[PDB]
């Protein structure tokens, strides 16, 4: 696996999402697009907006075709509405192919675009079942795969800087790689461990076991996938269902309760600061997620460091310090393996064989002591029972 053109083609930050550059229409207009495995709608700003430095102008694409249907997408936070249509799309640092795709011209947004986030659109990489207005609205990836020789698979290497990033610095830094139709061997170390996709809608997985420093949380594993568990590049934190959240937090407090912390810290509302270079990593637990594997009774695990679940943030005050926001949050809609998780791993969305691969990111953020890992195989029983059912 060797796709040199697409290595380093993303930019961004776990806080505001990762984006790739695309083009649209004839002649073609360049837009930065947020990569989002947590939805299935390709949509772009098509009208001016405080935060947007540029936008899609249909009136200038000779190949644009209006579909005369409105759409409305509501995300976990933020929502928009637009008009549907099609036009020709390309990725400059992707494969040299052009593709007619459904595109939503976003005409009203609310809490959607981020100030100086640098992206102007969203690329929903998930499956048609969750496309709005309905599943007959074919997702971008589907079209790419149907109309060209690109294989039905892509991979993401989300890279964290290790420290806060400016807007200037985000633009100039490399934010990661999105390999389309492939796996690049140089972006990961160790081995790819695949988990099955439970159902083609979100990229849904089953978590069978959860460990903090190796200590099982001892829960009916059904609790970890209540009511789904998904991988999502457009979610900042690892988000967890209420029962599990409290249980997990408790455990971490215990593991590093050589320091009690502001209560608003855990609820993600406050920073924590240490002097430059003096961040006490070793005092913080590692988290392990065991994921249903390929064969019956077989699973594997992935392990994240505190470097993953404590987001670096710029302290406007002091600024010569090292500050973090706690990047694990509560959820009332199942588990979400957000970007904070993924920046540990090369992740492989093997749509063609209904499975998701994990490997250790060649670019991951680590200390001279521990390091993140993808280990297996483990033997767990009656895994199907961890799946939750409506």
């Amino acid at each position: 696996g060797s796709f040199v053109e697409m290595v380093d083609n993303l930019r961004g930050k776990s806080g505001q999402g990762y984006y790739v550059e695309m083009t649209v229409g004839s002649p073609p207009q360049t837009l930065n697009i947020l990569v989002d495995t947590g939805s299935s709608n390709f949509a772009v700003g098509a009208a001016p907006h405080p935060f947007l430095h540029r936008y899609y102008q249909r009136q200038l694409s000779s190949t644009y075709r209006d579909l005369r249907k409105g759409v409305y997408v509501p995300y976990t936070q933020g929502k928009w509405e637009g008009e549907l249509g099609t036009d020709l799309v390309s990725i400059p640092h992707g494969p040299n192919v052009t593709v007619r795709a459904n595109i939503a011209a976003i005409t009203e947004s609310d809490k959607f675009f981020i100030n100086g986030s640098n992206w102007e659109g969203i690329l929903g990489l998930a499956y048609a079942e969750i496309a709005r207005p309905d599943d007959s609205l074919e997702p971008f990836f589907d079209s790419l795969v149907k109309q060209t020789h690109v294989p039905n698979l892509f991979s993401l290497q989300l890279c964290g800087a290790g420290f806060p990033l400016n807007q200037s610095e985000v633009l100039a830094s490399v934010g990661g790689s999105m390999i389309i139709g492939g796996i690049d061997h140089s972006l990961y170390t160790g081995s790819l461990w695949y988990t099955p996709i439970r159902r083609e809608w979100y990229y849904e997985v089953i978590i069978v076991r959860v460990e903090i420093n190796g200590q099982d949380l001892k829960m009916d594993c059904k609790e970890y996938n209540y009511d789904k568990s998904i991988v999502d590049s457009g979610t900042t934190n690892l988000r967890l269902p209420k029962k599990v959240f409290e249980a997990a937090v408790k455990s971490i407090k215990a593991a590093s309760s050589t320091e009690k912390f502001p209560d608003g810290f855990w609820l993600g509302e406050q920073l924590v600061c240490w002097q430059a270079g003096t961040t006490p990593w070793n005092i913080f637990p590692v988290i392990s997620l065991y994921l249903m594997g390929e064969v019956t009774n077989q699973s594997f695990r992935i392990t994240i460091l505190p470097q993953q679940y404590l987001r670096p943030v710029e302290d406007v005050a002091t600024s010569q310090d090292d500050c973090y926001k706690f990047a694990i949050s509560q959820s009332s809609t199942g588990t979400v393996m957000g970007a904070v998780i993924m920046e540990g791993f090369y992740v492989v969305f093997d749509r063609a064989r209904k499975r998701i691969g994990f490997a250790v990111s060649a670019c991951h953020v680590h200390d001279e002591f521990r390091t993140a890992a993808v280990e297996g195989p483990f033997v767990t029983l009656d895994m199907e029972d961890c799946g939750y059912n409506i």
Binding site: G15, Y75, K79, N237
Partner: peptide, 9 residues
């Protein structure tokens, strides 16, 4: 923070 599509809304 980003948090990308909802069920129903």
């Amino acid at each position: 923070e980003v948090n990308x599509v909802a069920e129903x809304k």
